[PDB]
Amino acid sequence: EKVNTKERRYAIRSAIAATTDPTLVSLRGHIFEAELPIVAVNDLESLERTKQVIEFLEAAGLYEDVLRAKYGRHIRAGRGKLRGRKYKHKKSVLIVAGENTPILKAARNLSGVDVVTVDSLNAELLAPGTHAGRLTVWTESAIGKLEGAFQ
Amino acid sequence: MGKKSLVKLTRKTNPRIVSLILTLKERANGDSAPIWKDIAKRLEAPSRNYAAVNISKINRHTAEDDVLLIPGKVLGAGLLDHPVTIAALTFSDSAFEKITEAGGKCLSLEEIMEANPKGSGIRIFR
Amino acid sequence: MDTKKFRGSRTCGGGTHKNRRGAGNRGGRGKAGGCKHHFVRAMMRGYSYGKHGFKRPDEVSRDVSIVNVGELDELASYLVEEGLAEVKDGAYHINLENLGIEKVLGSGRVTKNLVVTSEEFSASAREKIENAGGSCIDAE
RNA sequence: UUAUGCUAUCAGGUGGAUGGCUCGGCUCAAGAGCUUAUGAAGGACGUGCCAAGCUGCGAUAAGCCCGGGGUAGGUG
RNA sequence: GAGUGUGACAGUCACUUAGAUGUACGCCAAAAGACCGGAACAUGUCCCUGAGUACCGUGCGUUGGAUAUCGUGCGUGAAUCUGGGGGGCACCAACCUCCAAAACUAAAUACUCCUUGAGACCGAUAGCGAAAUAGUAGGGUGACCGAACGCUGAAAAGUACCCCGAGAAGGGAGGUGCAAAGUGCCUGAAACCUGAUAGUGAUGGAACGAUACGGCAUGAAAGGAUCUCUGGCAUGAAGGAAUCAUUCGCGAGGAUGUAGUACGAAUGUCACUGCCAGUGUCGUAUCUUACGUUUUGAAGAACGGGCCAGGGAGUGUAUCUUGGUGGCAAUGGCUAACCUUUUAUCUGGGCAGCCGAAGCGAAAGCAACAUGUGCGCAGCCUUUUGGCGAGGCACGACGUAU
RNA sequence: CCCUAACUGGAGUCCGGUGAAGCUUACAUUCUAGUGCACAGUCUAGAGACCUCUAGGGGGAAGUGAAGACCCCGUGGAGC
RNA sequence: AAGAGCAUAAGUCAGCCUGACGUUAUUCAGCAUAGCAGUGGAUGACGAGACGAAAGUCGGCUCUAGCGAACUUUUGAGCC
RNA sequence: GGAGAUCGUGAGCUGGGUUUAGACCGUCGUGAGACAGGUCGGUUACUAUCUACUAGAGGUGCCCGAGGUCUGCGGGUAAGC
Ligand SMILES: [K+]
Ligand SMILES: [Mg+2]
Ligand SMILES: [Mg+2]
Ligand SMILES: [Mg+2]
Ligand SMILES: [Mg+2]
Ligand SMILES: [Mg+2]
Ligand SMILES: [Mg+2]
Predict the structure, then answer these.
(1) Cα A8 to middle of ligand 7, angstroms
(2) Which cystines does this chain contain (chain C)?
(3) Is the C-beta of residue C135 closer than 7 Å to nucleic acid chain E?
(4) Nucleic chain E: which protein residues 40-69 of A have CB below 7 A from it?
């Protein structure tokens, strides 16, 4: 399918703005206790172990969503299991970083979690299943690098 | 808003258009102002026939401080010599720049609905 | 077509089941029959028999890009602010060569002093530019 | 105790549908790309303790020798 | 926290994974050495620079190649730097451009036996013909055509012993196992066949049913409990008597009154009751000559089906047109290939090009209204009759061809 | 042949064993007339008819077998 | 041909003539309603005329038949 | 005497005729071939499901149980011409 770059960027901007509305995010399925949007200081990008990410997410009131994705992982019904789609996975938290940093590997294995940079940000990360309202953690560098990102 | 109006509304996908149609019919009721019901019926019509009015028509047919409501988009072809307030669904970048530099206002249908609910003095442009 | 809506219709909107067989149900393949039984259809769709005129070689034939004096006049300030034109003692100096246009046409109004250099002008473009106080310059 | 039968359900037989499972298939992508007179590919026949097919092998015949990896089982 | 295996769903049980290590032969490979050697200018009655070739005539094929593609059959056939070829018919002239008739040459490209990976793919009548003792069994003299067949269980624990039996069959009894799942063994539908139960049945009429009411049987769950049965009372729409009195009519009867009354679909309410709904079969009553198709006309003595199960028919590319919904918008829209992929997504680039932006004309060519007037819908104002009036409509003017 | 008869062996008939195939939407004990695409076991109105089985020849089922080979049609073929 | 039209004529004779003209727009009717062609026929315009005092009439012969696409060639005028 | 019954009757028969492929004669046609002339030759499938009929049985109904003898609602006849 083709979508014009202008309207694709419009859709991306709409999905980014949807990460700030608590009603859309909680209606999307996420469990959280933070205040949106969640902007984290840049030192989140320099932490290299999953335990550090767990501590940050618990201090931010976001780890409940990760636990929901982990315990909500379920073996799906039908032929997809034989084809290689054994599980139906949930989406929990989107971490957006300013550039390629250790936080990509550090947060990578968290259940339901996506960690990407501003360059690699698209509509399907911000609206899984075409539903906007993804619970996302932005870093300072990501917010600084988003000034003319899709406009 | 019977089954025909409901078909037209359910057809639309832009939530701004749906909310505008609903609120315009509510305002036509409450204010007793057929201008808003008229705008709602124009917005319910097929989107392929929405107004795309250039600046040249506005300049040709308007006087100073003339309030225009365009049930569609304002485009930027032409020149605008006098200030004019324009309520439109959207604006081009050039249309916005021209209207701003000429001394006019580029407001939306919601803003004009809030500014004067009766619609007095408002002239519809297609 | 909507295959699902016709599940149960048997004929699937075709009328008789004896319809929808081959090119015989279209009167032939492609735009056949334009002299015999699709003659009126050929007239309607523009495929009527005949030849007309001649073509000159593309290597000698040429079309000229155009711009009317109204278009130049009423967006000349944008041209100067974008760099394609300059203001010399109040007169707009427009060179159509860097715009990609080779003929100025005379549709519209000229309200300012335009000093226009172009490969060609219509006569009416000449009078409209010269009455506005400007001049027309040919490209040698 | 009305037989020969008719209709419905049930039990069983026959049968192999349905469901579930799948070391198979198909398609796309990324690689890699010649071989044989130093006798190839392919075929025939043989070859196993009990071995008919297939597979492997060639009268040294489900195999022989050397080096490395593997290590306690092996004998398609 | 990819996944697979393991006695049911596993990041932590196993193999893995993420991430690191190692590796014989090979392959690429930088520093540093050895070697043939390269590039300008001046001078010119100087020398050389590809032949059955280039070209041309004619025939044919081929091509979009049109008197202007390429090939090649026949014929003919040059020139030599003061030269030769090309510039879409030939020739002349000018200008521009090249140097054939000898030779090689990486990369970017194509493909899929093969390797790896992946998948909105198929899931055993599907997907390859082949889940391969499958190009096999089998068929054809031959060229060649070509199947069917997957599954015990966690573990064989794959049924000891005993009885019957001619039995190395089979059956019974008895075991194993959570479960016979008992070896072509998971589940185990229907057709078909055997038996049982319910109803009916040897006086009976046929689209096998629908509807209503009954007999018999059933009515555990999943259906009702002011529900079912049987009555009372109140209100009751349309409709609406009987009987009697009077009168009219030749008569069958009519009219008026009784009487818009008693009643009346139903709607409430109060008692009573233990059934009712549903299901199977049979009976009585009314109705209907199957279904699909071809047909003006089908129950047809028109075509199709023995039955059941499964399979079985509007799809993709390109292009044109048009709707609904959107992005952007004359300072227009969109990019194509391609690059950026860190494994097909994606993000950011990419203006080549296409469409729109000026038409008319065969062509040469020439080239238009940013509104001159009127009517007037919506909307707004209004003294409710008018006014303004985007869009719309009708003119006027202008561009060009004739 | 008039005009058939008797007899012989093999089938058939009856018994034991073995053991297919072909027609089939359904129902079906019919008969007459009408009707209806004008050639009905099923429609309509009558008349008949207790069921099952065996043997028997073929009246009917416009019986079964075969997308009529006759005729026409098809901008269908082939040969000559 | 057939039907219709025509009498101070649309008939007959005579005088003068060549409108049996070049270009061009609509609308009819072939083809009701209601799309469809080459055409045909009515009303006009432009440019030139004939007759006639003028008005007029004349785009042949009173009206309705006597005819043919595209491609191709040839012919006419001037151009590309 | 005449006529009807799918010009009754080929799951009864026959096959002389017509109505295939072969061939001859005449005619027609340039010819292939044709003829509503003539001529010679030329394959007749099926195990009966239902219904109908012809005969022969077993049942059930009626019925004290059984047996015997009758009656005759009816059906048929050409039983003679
Ligand atoms: K598992
Ligand atoms: Mg793992
Ligand atoms: Mg298969
Ligand atoms: Mg297959
Ligand atoms: Mg099916
Ligand atoms: Mg035809
Ligand atoms: Mg017969």
Answers:
(1) 85
(2) none
(3) no
(4) none
